[PDB]
Write a protein that binds this ligand. Structure first.
Ligand code: NI
Length: 87
């Protein structure tokens, strides 16, 4: 099973969580054990797209990742509140 992996810390450190494609609100992230304001790095399967949103329900600033990322950027860091994952 291919999945996006979200990591708590820089360079894929700390706690991590795997998620299949989908559109996850903040509550859904928390249910899958991803707290708010937590994600710092992520791995993305080849050909996939991850749209990280600053606020809930897929709003606010949107950062897009299409490959493995040891650091999501200073603005994006610990700001993920909702996210859309595409294969
Ligand atoms: Ni794992």
């Amino acid at each position: 099973t291919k999945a996006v992996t979200f990591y708590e810390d820089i360079n894929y450190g700390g706690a991590h969580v795997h998620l299949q494609p989908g559109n996850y609100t903040l509550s859904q992230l928390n249910t899958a054990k991803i707290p708010n304001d937590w994600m710092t790095s992520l791995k993305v399967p080849s050909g996939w797209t991850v749209d990280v949103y600053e606020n809930d329900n897929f709003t606010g600033t949107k950062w897009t990742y299409t490959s493995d990322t040891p650091w999501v950027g200073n603005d994006a860091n610990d700001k993920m509140t909702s996210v859309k994952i595409y294969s």
